[PDB]
Design an enzyme around this catalytic site. Structure first.
Site, PDB file in Angstrom:
ATOM      1  N   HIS A 214      11.149 -77.608 -65.436  1.00 13.36           N
ATOM      2  CA  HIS A 214      10.162 -76.758 -64.733  1.00 13.36           C
ATOM      3  C   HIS A 214      10.851 -76.031 -63.577  1.00 13.36           C
ATOM      4  O   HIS A 214      10.307 -75.035 -63.164  1.00 13.36           O
ATOM      5  CB  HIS A 214       8.902 -77.542 -64.332  1.00 13.36           C
ATOM      6  CG  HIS A 214       9.033 -78.504 -63.190  1.00 13.36           C
ATOM      7  ND1 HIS A 214       9.153 -79.878 -63.391  1.00 13.36           N
ATOM      8  CD2 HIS A 214       8.941 -78.335 -61.852  1.00 13.36           C
ATOM      9  CE1 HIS A 214       9.180 -80.502 -62.229  1.00 13.36           C
ATOM     10  NE2 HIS A 214       9.043 -79.577 -61.268  1.00 13.36           N
TER      11      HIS A 214
ATOM     12  N   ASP B  44      11.938 -83.674 -68.819  1.00 12.75           N
ATOM     13  CA  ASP B  44      11.919 -82.562 -67.830  1.00 12.75           C
ATOM     14  C   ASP B  44      13.313 -82.380 -67.209  1.00 12.75           C
ATOM     15  O   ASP B  44      13.577 -82.788 -66.046  1.00 12.75           O
ATOM     16  CB  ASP B  44      10.829 -82.808 -66.804  1.00 12.75           C
ATOM     17  CG  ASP B  44      10.476 -81.599 -65.980  1.00 12.75           C
ATOM     18  OD1 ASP B  44      11.191 -80.579 -66.074  1.00 12.75           O
ATOM     19  OD2 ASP B  44       9.482 -81.706 -65.248  1.00 12.75           O
TER      20      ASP B  44
ATOM     21  N   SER C  13      11.420 -82.431 -56.917  1.00  9.78           N
ATOM     22  CA  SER C  13      11.682 -82.095 -58.340  1.00  9.78           C
ATOM     23  C   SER C  13      13.180 -81.888 -58.533  1.00  9.78           C
ATOM     24  O   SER C  13      13.796 -81.187 -57.720  1.00  9.78           O
ATOM     25  CB  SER C  13      10.923 -80.877 -58.815  1.00  9.78           C
ATOM     26  OG  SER C  13       9.533 -81.114 -58.754  1.00  9.78           O
TER      27      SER C  13
END
Ligand SMILES: [Cl-]
Ligand SMILES: [Cl-]
Ligand SMILES: [Cl-]
Lengths: 695, 697
Positions: free
Chosen positions: B64, B206, B632
């Site tokens: 992402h 991810d 992240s």
């Protein structure tokens, strides 16, 4: 794994002892004496219950006593939502049309029944499964004046293992069964429909009755003169609770299983029965919910019909999950391949021929059965105006004396039942347009109910116009349209009425299909008698149980949770904390009873809390249960009552075909929570004092 | 509670970390005067974290985080976003425009220096002590004249911490030639898509793979075909040892924002204004939008992204409100401040109590304005697409009232109309959203306080919200293409001045800016009181067991691989498996489609050295580390500092953790490095990346 005959307790007792059963075989089931079996009842024809005092107190589920609680509920005393607690025996409420059935004696009469059946001639007579024929044989074995010489007692013979085994039951029936106690609906039905088939569960699903009899403890219909039954056996209530891996066992009346389906029957059940129900109810429920969420008045009108449709929808989603993920089809192929191989070795081809008759019958009826389920899910239960009034012959003659007004008055009554307080024509039209659009896509013209051809012929494929016309022109389309008809009724109006012709032709097609399909049942039943005979001769009547048939069975296993999916574990036990975290005052399903909140806030759990001081609500077990097991007693290793079966998780519904050790659980209300609600919510101390509660 | 620690605080934390299972030596993790694992951590593209995993500058971050890069290189012809991307040679690695990676070269405590400079006070209420302009002036001063040119690729920044009680100067090294090397298909990189956002258990792969490029000397340079892979000071060793329940884990990265020093009053405000209004208003908007999306496949395609964008902070606000209701966040802040007030009285210093009283009185005073501000922002500014319909500029109104500047002003206004009424805009959906949002807005905001134009609902339309809205679209130049084209043919200033959609947009933006301008004066007194409050807390309990709020600076956090119980009788374990991917597979839901090469890997049990001792294929794990937005892509380290995963999410039950860490609910959601390597190996077939990494047994 199984739902075992009481006869099979001898054969299972050793295995049960290994798993931690502590009681003597004959205290659990004695064929020629009093045993714990004598405390189990078939409650109101569809549930189990149990006697829990020497004055005939009976526990069963709240959802089992629901109709009796509601029938005594008024605006003045609303027992359904407030609950009900008779503070003296004299205040316990009689119930019309209630029964409890005791299983007094059970006898193997297999040889008797097979001797009698050899007077056949016709080799494919279905008398070996006929309740009339088996009742004639029961009466002959019992005596001509049996029920007269043995007051309260009757006899019944049932087939097991596809007609390879027969039992005669001596039954004692009581019909004076009074409502004693029920929790508020907020407790008895806490999850309401949202937690149906769901573990973890937080529902106190119980209610309390009492069996009344004559001065001698013999069955009698309701009388002010009847007295509580003094039973020969009742359950002691344990307050010792449960721990993970504890031995648990259940007695009760499982309704139906399909443990001997062929692979071809699993495929049929998946691809016709389940797929059609799922597809048609999702369309129906989708339109209904849109309309309920847009209009609060439609929500109040359609909420019971929505919940009624969702219940078997969910079961079908659960069953198809099992077929897809637990290899049910493959395991039945393996079972039948193993039998066929063994029959080849033994030089007996009848087992392979029997499996082949079943496969051939399933394949031959596929199109008919698909058309049946499509009309039944799509229209008969899918479209409310399928059940609009159809004039009888005694009405059409009368319309054309001057009992014309009697005919109109009967039809008026039926119209008012159809277009009642909860009927919306606008909702029904939207549901019909969606359901018919799907039906017309799946059923070809040549197979349509005669009236539905008008969609192609008259209406140029416009389903909305066809439905709009049914309501625009029908005398059942609106109150005003019916009153115009009722003033100037002619048989010509009725005979050409589009709603009447709709309802008539869909019900004609439904019965035409029913009648074409019933013949296909018998070859499968006969082939099954041979199939199951082979399975038992090959592998023995010891690790494979007879299908459920609403007769008393026992099942044993352990208090154990399970993993529903990767990295998720559901434990063996829920607590009152789980109730409080679900509380949502504005969602009627998850309202918490204020006295119960107060009890939680003040930790007022008395002797009913566990080791940790936490208040248990429910546990789950590896017992093998199905519909009919609803109010079943759950026993200790010592046969003491530790709870009341009330549901099973959706992951386990495929267990009617193939037991699922890693997913299938019985969902059980903890007896400790039952007594807490009686004590601290009901304030009904006399019920606790009357039970025998073991330290 | 369990913290986002300054690198400076490793010294005072190392002993606790060692008894929690840390094995590596202190200065291998962070050394102010030498190379350490801190040198393998990057701020990826301004918002995310990444880590260097080879001596040829290979970088791992989240899928992402690398999504926009993967998408900007995607066409119908080579759809990299759907199929993945695996550069088989360094030369095939794709440059990206407007990308960066920032190394934290040096960190320095400059508190004394900044406090000395601040004493040249004019105003004692000067907000310069937090001004990035002013702190940049103090950084330029200290670093030197033309530090820029004297050290190319290096830059200096001073940031405030602990509400202006601690200042750090960072020397940053920025590379802008960062090439796409590797991405899994979307079906792996965002397997749960939006359904599984903020959800544990989690089965999403991810990750994405980049490489830092530089000049011959390993100095930063814009993209040129002449650039060569960076030889870094330090990269991570990859572990295949995996994780077990209760294992030590730690993270380094750039947590963005926390509010650990909120008063009880600020928690009440957050709950009852910010969160309740966002929840209420987005539930109305999302309800209308979903009904329209379900009824019309075309609207579904048009409104899917807008629905999803609304839902993200909706779910966050729901999680945050759950923590406030069930985890005593308000009570714990009340106790923290009552503690400091007690200690203050015994010190004979009332300024701590005076500071909490200032915050409470300011929060109380601004309640009505802030309610009005959230109501209009959530209700209209964000809620109603035609709030952002074109408003003629001062210079466009002016220009329309003698030249060919008229055809200029009309073409400017056409481009802005075409942007508003684009391929995803439905006037019919917007009218239904607007009727529901305005009805709720008009219920809450009295006539006196309405944007001027919304007064017409009562005064002109007899309370009929539907009529008012119908009228805006009927008579407005922007109500349809035809109506705009009719206006563009014969434009008058007077048409635009009385256009109901212009008056609406204008009117609501006026009130939005008025509330903002009235609310700004209340920030400064809370900030100065917070300087005093956090000063007191530090002095009372020490710079040891309370961490400074996140402020997009490099922090470390440590804890254990551990699941949790979300509710009665439910346990979520510490580790998900590829089996959980297969359980969720749904070929008719783009969110839960399973890559065929991955399903085959699962069916063949082709897991090599990547499977756990039991032969199950791990996917994701969760840990009691303390993360937030900005973390992240963050490296997750072993007790030995080896990479065992990438942080990529946090469970909704833990979002209240930005105010109060929640030991029994809050988890970092981490992609298992064993699954990253399996996907590189058996899905991408990109062996050169494996050989380029240093993989320990
Ligand atoms: Cl009895
Ligand atoms: Cl002071
Ligand atoms: Cl917590």
């Amino acid at each position: 794994e199984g739902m075992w005959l009481m006869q099979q307790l001898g054969r299972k007792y050793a295995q049960m002892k290994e798993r931690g059963l502590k009681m003597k075989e004959y205290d659990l089931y004695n064929p020629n004496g009093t045993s714990l079996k004598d405390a189990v009842v078939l409650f109101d024809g569809g549930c189990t219950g149990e006697v829990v005092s020497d004055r005939g107190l009976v526990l069963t589920n709240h959802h089992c006593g629901y109709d009796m609680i509601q029938a005594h509920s008024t605006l003045e005393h609303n027992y359904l939502e407030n609950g009900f607690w008779a503070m003296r025996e004299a205040d316990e409420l009689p119930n019309k049309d209630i029964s409890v059935v005791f299983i007094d004696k059970i006898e193997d009469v297999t040889d008797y029944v097979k001797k009698e059946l050899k007077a056949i001639k016709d080799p494919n007579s279905m008398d070996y499964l006929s309740p009339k024929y088996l009742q004639k044989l029961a009466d002959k074995k019992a005596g001509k004046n049996f029920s007269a010489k043995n007051p309260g007692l009757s006899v019944e013979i049932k087939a097991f293992y596809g007609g390879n085994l027969y039992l005669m039951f001596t039954k004692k029936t009581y019909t004076d069964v009074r409502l004693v106690g029920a929790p508020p609906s907020s407790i008895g039905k806490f999850g309401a429909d949202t937690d149906n088939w769901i573990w973890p569960r937080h529902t106190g699903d119980f209610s309390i009755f009492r069996i009344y009899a004559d001065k001698n403890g013999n069955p009698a219909p309701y009388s002010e003169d009847n007295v509580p039954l003094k039973p020969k056996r009742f359950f002691n209530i344990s307050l010792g609770g449960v721990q993970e891996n504890d031995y648990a066992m259940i007695m009760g009346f499982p309704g139906t299983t399909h443990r001997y389906f062929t692979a071809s029957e699993v495929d049929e059940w998946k691809s016709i029965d389940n797929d059609i129900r799922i597809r048609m109810r999702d369309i129906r429920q989708g339109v209904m919910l849109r309309e309920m969420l847009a209009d609060p008045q439609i929500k109040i009108m359609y909420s019971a019909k929505y919940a009624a449709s969702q219940n078997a929808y969910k079961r079908a989603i659960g069953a198809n999950w099992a077929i897809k993920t637990r290899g049910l089809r493959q395991n039945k192929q393996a079972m039948q391949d193993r039998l066929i191989a063994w029959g080849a070795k033994q030089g007996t081809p009848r087992y392979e021929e029997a499996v082949h008759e079943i496969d051939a019958t399933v394949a031959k009826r596929a199109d008919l059965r698909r058309r049946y389920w499509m009309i039944e899910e799509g229209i008969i239960r899918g479209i409310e105006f399928a059940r609009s009034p159809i004039p009888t012959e005694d009405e059409t003659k009368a319309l054309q004396a001057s009992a014309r007004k009697e005919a109109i008055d009967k039809i008026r009554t039926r119209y008012s039942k159809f277009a009642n307080k909860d009927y919306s024509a606008e909702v029904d039209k939207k549901v019909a347009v969606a359901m018919l659009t799907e039906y017309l896509k799946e059923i070809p013209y040549e197979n349509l109910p005669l009236h539905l051809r008008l969609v192609k012929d008259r209406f140029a494929g416009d389903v909305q116009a066809y439905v709009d016309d049914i309501f625009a022109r029908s005398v059942f389309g609106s109150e005003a349209q019916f009153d115009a008809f009722a003033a100037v009724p002619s048989v010509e109006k009725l005979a050409e009425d589009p709603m009447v012709l709709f309802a008539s032709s869909v019900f004609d097609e439904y019965r035409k299909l029913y009648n074409e399909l019933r013949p296909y049942d018998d070859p499968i039943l006969r082939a099954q008698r041979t199939y199951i005979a082979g399975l038992l001769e090959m592998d023995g009547d010891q690790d494979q149980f007879p299908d459920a048939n609403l007769t008393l069975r026992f099942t044993y296993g352990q208090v154990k949770g399970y993993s529903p999916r990767d990295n998720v574990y559901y434990g063996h036990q829920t607590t009152l904390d789980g109730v409080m975290e679900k509380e949502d005052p504005d969602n009627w399903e998850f309202v918490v009873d204020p006295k119960l909140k107060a009890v939680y806030e003040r930790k007022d759990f008395g002797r009913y809390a566990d080791r940790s001081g936490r208040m248990p609500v429910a546990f789950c077990a590896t017992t093998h249960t199905t519909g009919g097991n609803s109010g079943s007693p759950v026993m200790n290793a010592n046969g003491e009552l530790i709870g009341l079966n009330f549901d099973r998780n959706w992951e386990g519904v495929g267990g009617d075909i193939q037991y699922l050790a890693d997913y299938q659980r019985s969902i059980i209300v903890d007896i400790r929570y039952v007594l807490l609600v009686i004590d601290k919510v009901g304030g009904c101390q006399r019920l606790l004092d009357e039970m025998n509660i073991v330290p």
